[model samples]
Target chain A: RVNSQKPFNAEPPAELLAERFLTPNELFFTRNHLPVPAVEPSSYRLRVDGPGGGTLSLSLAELRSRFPKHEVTATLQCAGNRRSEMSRVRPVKGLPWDIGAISTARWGGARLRDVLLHAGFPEELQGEWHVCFEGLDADPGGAPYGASIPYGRALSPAADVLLAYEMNGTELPRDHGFPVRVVVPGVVGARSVKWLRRVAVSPDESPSHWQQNDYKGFSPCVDWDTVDYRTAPAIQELPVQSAVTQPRPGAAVPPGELTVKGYAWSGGGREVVRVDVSLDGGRTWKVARLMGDKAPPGRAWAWALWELTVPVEAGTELEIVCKAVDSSYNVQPDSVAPIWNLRGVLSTAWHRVRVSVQD
Target chain B: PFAGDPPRHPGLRVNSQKPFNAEPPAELLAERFLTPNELFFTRNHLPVPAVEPSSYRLRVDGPGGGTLSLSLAELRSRFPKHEVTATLQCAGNRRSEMSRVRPVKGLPWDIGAISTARWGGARLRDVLLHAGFPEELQGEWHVCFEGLDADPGGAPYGASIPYGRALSPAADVLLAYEMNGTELPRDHGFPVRVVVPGVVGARSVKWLRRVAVSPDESPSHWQQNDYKGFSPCVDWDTVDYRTAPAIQELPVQSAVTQPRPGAAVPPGELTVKGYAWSGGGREVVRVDVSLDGGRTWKVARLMGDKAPPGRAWAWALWELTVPVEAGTELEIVCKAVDSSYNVQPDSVAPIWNLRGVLSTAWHRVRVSVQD
Candidate 1:
């Protein structure tokens, strides 16, 4: 693929991402660890079982009719969304994803809580626990993709965990998990297993390396040499994140007034309350106007689009910086080095783009 | 017109005797996550008022409703009780640090002007629901608070928060009746107070008596002419309070507490401890400590477990030990990062406001190493 290095993983051009609030399906970034699996909806079945209850297999038709359909507008971001930026700070491992690894969509699905209830939720096991999700897509070794989330998140009415079958207004594409996928809003995309087929409730988390040894954060001092995976908790909700999408970094501008556009989002239902833009690089900042519907409390899963216009002098080099603040008053870091990890995950520093103006 | 001052712990360093502004000693700050009530800092603009639990009547009136009054008993009985542990910091917690850059008007406070406690009360959302909150006034409204403590001109302490914050279940604003498993002490707003979990302390009106839902902010002098931030370029000569909005939340902040400035420490294996916090329910995620004037930094060990999301009312206690050569002078500094990755600015001069409020810069302390 022109935009990808790995198999079946491609990202749409950066400029096209900001064209709409819900990224078009064809233009949406795709990150498949394996070739897309094919299955007919007529014969497809979803199996759910665990310590909480007995196994229950249901058809896709039952999944849609037995539970109330819920729709959510959420942004799904790869753990390696900005891994390439981390490479610039210092060489790091993993996929070389430039900011395009994140995309928003309007997803239609059935609530995971309702599905569990329909299968008979065991009241015996309560309190702190985990719920594992298994995907039908298999690796070369025949191991299926798998991940887990905390039980509290699945049971909480506000968490909005889903078994999604539709992307945008139509059926999901084959590359995007046609039959069904687990859509864990406000969580890392890794945990939202594509081609989802199994659910397990247990006191322990998923045994997959992806859950226990990967997709977690480490200190700045941590590197490939002395790193220990168990020391850090797996990333559940993401931190506040933002990036400038317009005015390609090296493009020359025609001077006079310039408008900058970007997208800001935070995980865990935290709404983006404000975005600040700086023209002279941290010397002074002006607030940007935000566009998006106001999300309700504990249910904000969408991103806020922002724009700022300012007068620029001719023949000037400008370093534009943007930082966003969430409803919880969380702001992105000013630089990338302090939060940089070995795997290059969570590279949510303030996004800066430098462009030279021409007379 | 003023009542006598309540007895305070001997550890607090009093800054004013009349209106009663004092800060707890830094040594006592790291002793626990929750600052003892006796050792908690106090900033009073006027004399403390004496309110009786039986006589205290909270009036809720404004858009879409007639006056609704409730006694303390009715408030407790009507809604389910909830507990939140949060830190409350005065806007001028570090004003004294700002004064060091240039003299500014306000209390000269040290790091002790902040404290955390377990506050229990009815949620503001439940209270509004019970008051028949107007459906027509959905967006862009303000919830104003009025205290019984008044000035000579008969003006009571007053402030307001955005209606969105008041209505959000995640905000966790409270009409607190108890603090730290006991009745609120007279000095700490006895009977009742507005406990806004993550906002600036000024918005949590003490001795709260009235709550009004309106389309505008409070008309109180503090709301219109004070408690706002200013550009470093704006001084008293050219300052205009109306130019900036009143501060609702605060920025990231931290301070070293174990070793005092101008004091001496043991040459080898010197331990430094401090506290870190951020406003608006943002949890303090990490803390960086430097013993070599910030040339090299070490990540501090944050004590206690990770706080609940948007409910981190308690400050993080961070401790770090470093080895120093004998007879060396050290500048120990500390700063914190919140869940949003927000960090404290390195210096105070850049954020200096004319009012000396919100002086959260990286806390630096210089000490001598004993041979």
Candidate 2:
């Protein structure tokens, strides 16, 4: 695993990522803002706060027994999945994650909607309210990792926000949220609070620095000096994103027919409708066939693994490029330059790799 | 002309008559940056409601019985008038292409389902804040809009947008009374309309009457069930209305207009013209044109593409000229990139949905060359 020392962000190798539609439990990517917290399943209590004065606390067993179970196959991707190349356009501050920072798992849990409604979630409250989540993991400043989603999304039965206890049909691994975690499907992975401790229905967003100043996009011209977080919407649903995982970059290959493979996904449950592969530096293209789950409409929360076969002539210099289109017809930018930002978030550009055709 | 029947330009390609839906020719749409009022597309969901300008009232309803009503005179004189150039495109702009992939059930609208004009009105935020939208609460709310145009079932056409979008100073949401610098046309909302720049046309309610600050979106048919997108594989039999969010900020879109498809030209020189635009305030930054079915591409010269950042509500016209060998059959294509660095899809089949909405892909036309 690539090293970041303290927080222990673990990303799987890209070579193994596109091999299986459902990534293995160990191969799952783990991102933690603070040191992983330890808690006994019996002692763990999830606090649910609402407009009224009373706060309801429930044990893991109480939640498991009281609420109905729902299963969702979701792909969680860090907004900074391609931050390494984004920095190459210009320098930015981030983890410098490669394309490996995304993985899919079948999560089993109680729906956040079911829990919120039962916990006296004021149904009368306006839809614009923020439902904030805080992780048990805390920093030196005593600030817990916090984020929020709009209240409407929390209430939507079809949105499928969950308080997950099981990952891939087994108990959550320590690296993944151990006792319990919030799984907000079809959004940036940041919103799925790990080691979830508290959920509050609030008029404003979380006061955490991450929610206030991070994970946002800006104009290419805007720099740190001129940037204002309030002007931009927090990165909730990510734009359409995709990446190549086969024939590792710069690897030599035979000049005959070539096989290419990759994964494509869009946030807000938008399905990846197509993946286009180009062999001649994007000067020409061929449509790739997609495999994986066949989800209905906007409920497609999984990534689509796609493959394409193209013939390469001998001694040809190839610039293999790929980009994805979602149900909304949103396409990744051709390159990374125009989307460069100081925070290095939302780095979805057409993935391009290079290789020399061999004998 | 009859008492309430206003004359319409003959140039419009009328899609329907009773509930008037007409769009201008593609060539004329690309001719001007600001479309003339008469030439602008009219997408009325119902017959034009005859609004008496003298008696028309705009009712602003906020939480906890806080309400304000203004007549046309008061609405015109009370607030600062802001003028913005914005393009409005129906969510089903290029639906005809989607219909070809499969038998999608919807109007088969061609690419001309969009147009732009200079709009004049009071900022919606100014009026909502004046009506006491509970700014102290600091909570986001839904700003539901209802048009006076009612269906046979006595329901007014309705929709709502995010309070964040309606209140942002940069969003340019307006309650417009003027179109193309003239009094608004009847078919296009005479007394007033919600001019939600950077949003889908359906949300910009014409003949607007009631504005509500609420905790939920409008429960009207169009808002709850119609405008939301679905998967191409999802048939109506298994579809759930609440499963998808209503169409909001549009995606990147561009289409070629100058050369009629299947035209046999005498020479190989081709001058292609088109229009490109994006929603959610992201401006179309670059347009790429390809001649050999996207095998090779060249940048097009853009015109009237200037707009303030995040408030870019207008479309940019583009033109590109290419010299090719005579007696050759050429496949032409164009795709656009927005300020957010989002590009268009490669084809329509990828994005074709049952509702036939959001058919934006790389716009293409096949033409044959002659010596």
Candidate 3:
């Protein structure tokens, strides 16, 4: 079921998020910047160009047969997942998204490195270069949705950048860029351009508004009046993030012991080692039990499901909080105001929910 | 002033005379890694207890219910002496800054309520083993400490630490008798004090006398009712301390000491120096310096040897030089990240607690640059 109408975005119910390790395609959150593009599978072609001055193009079938296929499970999160809370701190621009803007999936595709090697990539490059991706989806001006990442990240085997063709063992869904999409593990979802049609290796970053001006962070004091978009760099890897999914906010529960559950994740291949849960407004805390440890070393792109059970005094209101710590021990801030930014990006504060216990 | 109080150094800024809470001035804080004993911040909750070394006995009760009474001489002779250079800071060190945002209860301390010192003592783990620490600690238990420092009714300043940390060899918790390579000053815990390294200074009971192993946290007023953090919305009217645990390890913290806030600096290259530390033995891995508020940041050079993994108890002294234009107000901010990537928050507004116990915000100092 879709959550929004104007932009045609859809998000699974909060309960479905923790149902499966890899989100089902129909239930995975869809974030479309523009209307979904219509394409004929037979006519679709992915063009690879520049940095080495060599250009090549491949059809969808040719893409699958020519390059070796690799699969990776990763969680793609919108930068504004918790924008609603940040907006409460101060009115911010952009989507009024709740916490359902992130989802994990199994991506199957050709490794970008394999395709680059086949496209006559030079072993030695003169200076710095960046790889740009463009989706077939377009704006009213006919410009495609595009973004770029550093070339070093594209070439590094550890980065695991992919030109994915399949989602969750099936062909990509139309809402999720059917023919193909670029999957950049451990990076923001925006960098993983969907409906991927063009790849260019250039010396400069992408000139798109999303890359040049929109996704960067600004000081809390930098309101629309004094905002300067050029001063900040675009966000790549996200910070530590977690959220409480069970016992949704404003719900009533029976008094006494209750089970609390949530998910935690960190970007840039960092592992989430622990999650602390506070039942009475963060005055005290207890460590939650992590469901399973399945992510590989330096490839921790999956999310962790943690649960904690604690007693709530009867006839009292409870404020539950959850904060996660990564392998580096990086924990989330206690509140949103300190980390709040002008664009409402990176809202990874300790997730809080209030519930009333039955009298 | 309390009766029988020891003589104090003149450089310390006295916050109160009755309980004697004082901190050294900013300029003197970063002069050396090991803060001089005389200039060390003194946080006394009660009158200093007069102790005799010959008659002093440290009582230790293990988790398994075995008790051992040790004389000051046996405590020194029986166990191998250990030395650790660590920074001890009051939890309310920067409460004044929080108060500026909103009124908070507690001492209105500036940045000087912290000092680094070389503490010499026997490892607490070694003594716990001598007292027959159990093969296993069952349930959620804590090792409680009772100090000799007391009020008229005989209530000793008391606290408790988790059993895990008390027995963790790497924790470096110490039963210290020496400070700055000399006998402990009467103002500090003379005779003996539990130097619970990397924990809140409040837990390091001064004028140590009794140790008890219990299944619950200390019932003392300081442990149960005070020394806990509350939300900014919480106030004295609706405050409940039972919801919060007594603060143990502190978060990451750093402050600029070279250029005091509002101090004028000459144009051109200006050097910034500061001290950074993290509680729970997490080493301060990086110190980020910002010259234009928080628009841009540069990594500062960290001084001193890196401590072994999880054994970093000492504070890191860092410095950086930035070129600035003449006749401008430069806002300098410093935020430190520990080995675990735990960093101080960018500002104080969000973390302004009612008690102001943990004030580890990014320290910002604005200085007017002169031509």
TM-score against truth, every candidate: 0.85, 0.61, 0.61
DockQ-better candidate, 2 vs 3: 2
**Candidate 2 vs. truth: CA RMSD?**
12.0
**Superposed model 3: Cα runs more than 4 Å off:** A1-15, A18-240, A244-359, B62-66
lDDT for model 1 comes to 0.81
lDDT of 3 by residue, A276-338 (tens): 787788866666888866565447888888888888778899899887766533457766765
lDDT (Cα, 0-100) at B12 in candidate 1: 86
Report the lDDT of model 2 for residue B76.
88
Give me the displacement of residue A52 in model 3, in angstroms.
48
Rank the models by DockQ, top first: 1, 2, 3
The best candidate by TM-score is 1
Model 3, range B177-254, lDDT digits (tens) per residue? 999999999988998999988888899888899988788899898999988765455678888887555778777889
Residue range A219-258, candidate 2, lDDT tens digits: 5556779888885667677778888888788888898888
Better of 1 and 3 by lDDT: 3
Docking class of 2: incorrect
Give me the displacement of residue B14 in model 2, in angstroms.
12
- Give the better candidate number (2 or 3) by TM-score: 2
Kindly report which residue pairs in candidate 3 clash with one another: A283-B244, A328-B340
* Local accuracy of candidate 1 as per-residue lDDT tens digits, B73-144: 998898899888888898888788999898999888888889889998889888887788843354467899
Worst ten in a row by lDDT for model 3 chain B: B338-347
